[PDB]
Amino acid sequence: PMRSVFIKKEDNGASNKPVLSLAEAYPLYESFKQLQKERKAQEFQARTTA
Amino acid sequence: GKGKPRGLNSARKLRVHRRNNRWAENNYKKRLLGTAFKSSPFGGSSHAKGIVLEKLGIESKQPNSAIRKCVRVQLIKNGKKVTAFVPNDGCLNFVD
Amino acid sequence: MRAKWRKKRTRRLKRKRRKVRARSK
Amino acid sequence: TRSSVLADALNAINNAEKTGKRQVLIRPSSKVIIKFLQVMQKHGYIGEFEYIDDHRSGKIVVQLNGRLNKCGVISPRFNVKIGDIEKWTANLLPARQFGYVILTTSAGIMDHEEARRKHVSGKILGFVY
Amino acid sequence: PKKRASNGRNKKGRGHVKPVRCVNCSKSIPKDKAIKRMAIRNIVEAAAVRDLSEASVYPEYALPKTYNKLHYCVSCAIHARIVRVRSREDRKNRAPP
Amino acid sequence: GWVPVTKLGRLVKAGKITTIEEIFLHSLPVKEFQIIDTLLPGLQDEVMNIKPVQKQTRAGQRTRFKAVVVVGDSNGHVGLGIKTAKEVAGAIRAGIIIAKLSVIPIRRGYWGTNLGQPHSLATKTTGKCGSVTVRLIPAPRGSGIVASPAVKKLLQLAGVEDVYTQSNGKTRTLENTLKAAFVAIGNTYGFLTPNLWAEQPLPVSPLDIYSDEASA
Amino acid sequence: VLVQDLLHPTAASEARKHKLKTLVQGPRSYFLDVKCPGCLNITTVFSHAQTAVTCESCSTILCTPTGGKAKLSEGTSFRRK
Amino acid sequence: SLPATFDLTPEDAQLLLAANTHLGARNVQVHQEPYVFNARPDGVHVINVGKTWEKLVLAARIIAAIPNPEDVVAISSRTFGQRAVLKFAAHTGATPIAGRFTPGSFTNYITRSFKEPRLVIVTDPRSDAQAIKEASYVNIPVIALTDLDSPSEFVDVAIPCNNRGKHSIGLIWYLLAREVLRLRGALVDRTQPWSIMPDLYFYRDP
Amino acid sequence: GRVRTKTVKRASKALIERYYPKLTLDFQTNKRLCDEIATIQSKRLRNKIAGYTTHLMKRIQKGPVRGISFKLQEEERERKDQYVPEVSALDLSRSNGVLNVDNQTSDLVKSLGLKLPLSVINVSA
Amino acid sequence: MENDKGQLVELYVPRKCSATNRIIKADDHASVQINVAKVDEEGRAIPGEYVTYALSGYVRSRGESDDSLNRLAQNDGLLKNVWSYSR
RNA sequence: AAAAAAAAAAAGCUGCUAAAAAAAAAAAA
RNA sequence: AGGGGAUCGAAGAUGAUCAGAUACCGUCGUAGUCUUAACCAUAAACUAUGCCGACUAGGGAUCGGGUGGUGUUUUUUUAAUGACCCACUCGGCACCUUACGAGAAAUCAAAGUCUUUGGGUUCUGGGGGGAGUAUGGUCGCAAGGCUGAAACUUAAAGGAAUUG
Ligand SMILES: [Mg+2]
Ligand SMILES: [Mg+2]
Ligand SMILES: [Mg+2]
Ligand SMILES: [Mg+2]
Ligand SMILES: [Mg+2]
Ligand SMILES: [Mg+2]
Ligand SMILES: [Mg+2]
Ligand SMILES: [Mg+2]
Ligand SMILES: [Mg+2]
Ligand SMILES: [Mg+2]
Ligand SMILES: [Mg+2]
Ligand SMILES: [Mg+2]
Ligand SMILES: [Mg+2]
Ligand SMILES: [Mg+2]
Ligand SMILES: [Mg+2]
Ligand SMILES: [Mg+2]
Ligand SMILES: [Mg+2]
Ligand SMILES: [Mg+2]
């Protein structure tokens, strides 16, 4: 039960803070899901058509 | 069905199989071979007369410990030697 | 004893008895 | 192979009655089966049965009320005389007041009481109670 | 009495199965009876991954893995705790843990 | 006092049920022996044997006593109870209670031609327990009970006047052979006969007729 | 189920059952009335034909045998007779 | 028979189809269920809601035939049916057992929760297998809210339904309470609906 | 170890069950009321009971506790499960008066011979 | 059954199963007796007027009690379209 | 899509017999 | 008896271990292991479950074939095929759940339909040893196989489970 995670910065300086905060990204993620929701409806529409 | 034949014309098989199986009984085999006449010491008789050869002391089987006071005795009618226990308290003094 | 080795001992005894009887005959 | 169609039919009826079903299908439906079923139906142990005609050997659907305890075949079909009838009824009937040993006599297939009344005997077929 | 309906093996409708050898002791055991396990292992043992990554000449090196199928006899599997003795009712549980 | 806590016990104490024929007819589960000896005051009891049974412990063997008890009025009803206890007297008392709870009815009949009262059984019957199978066969008048002493006493306390028995298995297991004879005697009201072929109108239970004099 | 009508089973259940297991057994095969392009020459073909049935006028193979039903050729016209 | 005012009204059909009681189990199907009508694609089967309605009114007739209303016992170990059996208990006599059924409640007369019911109603026979097993020891009729794969052993009246849904269990318990009250006469208007909303018999997350 | 036995635990639960509004979240006052409101033969046992009671009052203040039910708790439970929505979920007002149904549900209701507003949407494998 | 001169003997004529017509024994504790209320012209159930079915422990344990009750109820007319003879 | 694991010096023997449970009645201030 | 004879390896040689250790463990190593021709006829040759036939509970999966579906995918978007999916069916190797039923129990869809005892048929057993021995046949080069007792001895051997 002692397993733990160790994080190390990359030496080159490649590691960097992400451009968007997690919070900022989430609505957009929801929007993709919303597009997917439209697409799931589209899948139903495609099924309905053929 | 069962391992026996059941047909209305299978009486010969039933009878023969019964004879073959009768041989596995102890009493039937003794009576049909005549082992009492052949190999029994008394020859199939209930009683037999004999002559005392000697006196013996037989140790008891477990879990008992005693000397049983038998006699080694040779039968008159066939000459076979057997061992006969002498019963009750002190009857070995009677048997000589 | 183990039955396999009892069978082996019996087979050896049977062979020895055959040899002795062949000496007799 | 199939050696007694009467044995198969009576076994199927027994297993149906034990399971509690009210109907049973029987293949392949001989004349002896029909007569045996007619004796059972006359004494009220089965009910109505129907013969289905294929052109092979026939099938039978038998209706079952709950009254049957056991119907069986006696195999082989033993030769039976007049006193041997009461010996057989003593061996395989539950009581002296009900139950029937069914036997094929020269005057047709009948139960043992009808055989006693006609004073005929024969070969034993089976039983019902 | 009979302990298992499968007789401790997996052979229904064959008769004979070619044997394999225990990886620990080289006992001959039929292939259906053995205690096959699949050792799929990283090549670098999870504590030298950083050292090999910084010593690599290549970026994004895939770091392969080793594949081995281990066959155990009953004695060696029980002694090495690969399987252990279960209770009478739990013996029938076929599912992996 | 009794103060029952069961609908059946309340009805039997109130007197709305006066015979055990209603209980047998409606298959009412009995859980109080005061019901049984209220409705059958004339049944008598007898112990067949006491045997010791032992359980091995870390410090010696723990010995308890197993009592097999038959109870029964000599016309129609019998019961068989088996109890182990630390004391022989307590085993006998609890076995009497259990035997009273197990009372069953007996179908007595005629070997033939039905002149007097039913003297024998109506059909052949068999019970099996363990290896023991006990078969009971109707017998003609004056035969008596052809049985071993224990099953003969059980049949006497049930009220059979004359019967044949056949036993197979290890009959010296007394508890097994007594349970097999109880199963055999119990199956007489299991066998369906042409006189019972006729249809009956399915009566209403006392537990619904007298539901006001029940628990509520 | 303890009560069912064995003498009148439903047509769906009889169609589901095997051909030897229906109330009265019978075939599930049929015959086809088959025309080939060119000559009219209407012919009768078994549904399970086991042989390359040819039109009597010309080498105009009408069916190809299969493990089950015969496989009719591409240019053919059939009616279930 | 019945005076034909007991037929499936269109509003009751709307309630059943909105609560999805017709959506039975998947292609797993117990042979003791002829209640299937026209198996749908995706493997789901459709229950004959007319048959569910007749079985429900037959069950309500049995409950109305029970003399003391507290001799009816409603069982639900399922959270989706706990509130349903509690409201059934509220609206009828019906001593309930919601939650854990302690073993030996129908046997074992010295238990503090020892009941002697004349009829038992359960929500799921598989989840309430202990109660039906105990009823089979002491001669108790059983009504069960079965599905198409429910274990029908020792079940006398099986009301077919969708017992996996939150709304269907509550609707069936609601309808059962409504019809047993109608046959008792507490609801004198057979034609007019009940003032109690069907959402009263529903499970809620908090 | 500091595991408290069932005499302490059962006495604490009974005390809370019949004296919840009287007693507090403070050990000293809980002790001073427990000694006069219960008959406990030992000062030590009284202290242990009052301490476990105070612990359970803290537990009760942080949400409800299983096994403990007092009058205020049960009256709040009944007042909450007598809740009913303003509009039924099973009402057809939601979804515009038409119940979405499949082909099989549609000819089911035609076989039942009932007329009701429905919309058919195809369900594919 | 009775003796030679009227006079019914055999205490306790037993019940028979409504589905399989087998004798319901005294110790058959898996057997039930269903009572269904009768309804008269207004939708109300009359107290004390039932139609009665007896089901044996065997059929209840085999799980045919529901189908058997369906058939018996439809035969007595208090079910309409539940049970089909042609299975 | 996970991480983990390899280990197996030596240890023979213990004389004979001996251990075992059934039924309940007393009436006293 | 020819061939082959890499590995492993009865015997054997050796090093340990050990009170001993011609045992286990280590290293070698003959016969053997493979093959051709001819013998041998045994195995816990086991499902310790003879074969043929009928019937009796639910459940899913799988192998071979067949039928159907405007089903999916691929080809020439689109045909036929093929591979999948769904439904059914015949025939298999099996499995899961129950116990109406069976059983001494363990357990068993047969080991059920058996005192409510009869579908057809073959083989085998009759307490434990002596003993698969002796003897006589017969087969085999041999090893041995098949057939196969008795005298005498003995109150238990044995099965399945329970608690320690
Ligand atoms: Mg013959
Ligand atoms: Mg002795
Ligand atoms: Mg063992
Ligand atoms: Mg083999
Ligand atoms: Mg004997
Ligand atoms: Mg020594
Ligand atoms: Mg030792
Ligand atoms: Mg020694
Ligand atoms: Mg060596
Ligand atoms: Mg052999
Ligand atoms: Mg063998
Ligand atoms: Mg068979
Ligand atoms: Mg297939
Ligand atoms: Mg298959
Ligand atoms: Mg196969
Ligand atoms: Mg013998
Ligand atoms: Mg012997
Ligand atoms: Mg043992």
Counted across chains D and G, CB pairs separated by less than 8 A come out at 22
What's the residue count for chain H? 206
CA distances from I106 to A45, H46, H172 (A): 20, 11, 21
Neighbours of chain E (3+ CB pairs under 8 A): none
CA dist B33 and H140 (Å) reads 70
CATH 3.30.1740.20 fits E1-97, yes or no: yes
CA dist H11 and I99 (Å) reads 12
CA dist F23 and F11 (Å) reads 11
Phi, psi values for residue J51, rounded to 5°: -105, 135
Characterize the bridge pairing of strands F77-85 and D71-73.
Answer: unpaired
Residue entry with tokens 């539901």:
F211
Angle between helical axes of H49-65 and H10-19 (0-180°, round to 10): 100
Q: Which residues touch strand K (CB under 7 A)?
A: A 3; B 62-63; E 24-25, 41-42, 45-46, 75-76, 79-80; F 47, 50-52, 54, 61, 63, 65, 87-89, 92
Domain of residue B75: give its range.
1-96
Task: Find the closest chain H residue to F5 by CA distance.
Answer: H109
- In this structure, are D86 and D103 located in the same domain? yes
Angle between helical axes of D31-42 and D5-19 (0-180°, round to 10): 40
Q: Which of D22, D46, D63 to mutate to test the interface with J (most CBs of J within 10 A)?
A: D22
Characterize the bridge pairing of strands F132-138 and F163-168.
Answer: antiparallel
Architecture of domain J1-87: 2-Layer Sandwich (3.30)
CA dist J25 and J15 (Å) reads 8
Which residue type, as a one-letter code, is found at position E53?
S
CA of C2 relative to ligand 18 center, distance in Å: 19
Sorted by sequence, the CB contacts under 8 Å of residue G1 that are 6+ apart come out as: H31, H32, J64, J67, J87
What's the residue count for chain E? 97
Neighbours of chain H (3+ CB pairs under 8 A): F, I, J
- In this structure, are D18 and D63 located in the same domain? yes
CB G4 within 8 A of CB D23: yes
CA dist H52 and H64 (Å) reads 18
Domain of residue D45: give its range.
1-68
Phi, psi values for residue D34, rounded to 5°: -65, -45
Sorted by sequence, the CB contacts under 8 Å of residue F47 that are 6+ apart come out as: F67, F68, F69, F92, F95
- In this structure, are D25 and D63 located in the same domain? yes
- Closest listed residue to residue H19, CA positions, set H65, H52, H66, H41: H52
Rg, Å, chain I Cα set: 28
- In this structure, are D107 and D120 located in the same domain? yes
Sorted by sequence, the CB contacts under 8 Å of residue E9 that are 6+ apart come out as: E30, E32, E33
Please report, for chain G, the start and end positions of each structural domain, with discontinuous segments joined by +. 1-81
Sorted by sequence, the CB contacts under 8 Å of residue H181 that are 6+ apart come out as: H91, H92, H187, H194
Neighbours of chain A (3+ CB pairs under 8 A): I
- In this structure, are D3 and D33 located in the same domain? yes
CA of F65 to C1' of K22 (A): 11
CB D104 within 8 A of CB D113: no
Please report, for chain F, the start and end positions of each structural domain, with discontinuous segments joined by +. 1-105, 106-199
Q: Which helix (H) or strand (E) holds F39?
A: helix F33-39
- Closest listed residue to residue F191, CA positions, set D66, D40, J59, D36: D66
Q: What class has domain G1-81? A: mainly beta
Domains in chain D, number: 2
The DSSP output letter for B64 is -
- In this structure, are D103 and D59 located in the same domain? no
Asked if H199 lies within 8 A of I85 by C-beta distance, the reply is yes
* Residues on chain I touching H36 (C-beta within 8 angstroms): none
Beta bridge partners of H120: H73, H142
CB F141 within 8 A of CB F119: yes
Task: Find the closest chain G residue to J72 by CA distance.
Answer: G3
- Closest listed residue to residue H140, CA positions, set F67, F7, D29, G59: F7
Instruction: Work out the number of other CB atoms within 10 angstroms of the CB of residue D55.
Output: 7
CA dist F208 and H118 (Å) reads 9
- In this structure, are D92 and D77 located in the same domain? yes
* Residues on chain D touching B6 (C-beta within 8 angstroms): 75-76
CA of D80 to C1' of L28 (A): 85
CB H123 within 8 A of CB H81: yes
The DSSP output letter for H46 is B
Domains of chain H: 10-200 (3.40.50.10490)
**Domain boundaries F106-199, corresponding CATH code:** 3.30.230.10
Token output for J49: 């007027």
Please report, for chain J, the start and end positions of each structural domain, with discontinuous segments joined by +. 1-87
CA of G18 to C1' of L64 (A): 18
**Strand K bases with any atom < 7 A from protein Cβ:** 3-4, 6-8, 16-18, 20-24
Alpha-helical runs (H) found in chain D = 5-19, 31-42, 82-92, 112-118
- Closest listed residue to residue I100, CA positions, set H53, A38, H48, H14: H14
* Residues on chain D touching J62 (C-beta within 8 angstroms): 20
CB D14 within 8 A of CB D40: no
Q: Which helix (H) or strand (E) holds C16?
A: helix C3-24
Sorted by sequence, the CB contacts under 8 Å of residue I124 that are 6+ apart come out as: A47, H41, H42
- Closest listed residue to residue I91, CA positions, set H87, H147, H193: H193
**Strand L bases with any atom < 7 A from protein Cβ:** 47-50, 52-60, 65-68, 71, 80-81, 85-90, 92-97, 100, 103-108, 111-127, 131-135, 143-144, 150-152, 155, 159-161, 163-164
CB F137 within 8 A of CB F164: yes
Beta bridge partners of I101: I120
CA distances from F96 to F37, F45, F53, F102, H170 (A): 11, 7, 19, 10, 50
- Closest listed residue to residue H6, CA positions, set J85, J48, J77: J77
CB J50 within 8 A of CB J71: no
| Three-state DSSP state, B32 | helix
CA of E15 relative to ligand 15 center, distance in Å: 13
Asked if D97 lies within 8 A of F197 by C-beta distance, the reply is no
Q: What is the CATH number of the domain that holds I23?
A: 1.10.60.20
Interface of F with J in 122-151 (CB under 8 A): 122
- In this structure, are D79 and D55 located in the same domain? no
Point out the nucleotide closest to F46 (alpha carbon to C1′): K23
- In this structure, are D64 and D94 located in the same domain? no
CATH 3.30.160.20 fits F1-105, yes or no: yes
CA dist D99 and D71 (Å) reads 10
Q: What is the CATH number of the domain that holds D81?
A: 3.30.1490.10
Which residue type, as a one-letter code, is found at position B61?
K
CA dist H136 and J61 (Å) reads 9
Characterize the bridge pairing of strands H142-144 and H119-122.
Answer: parallel
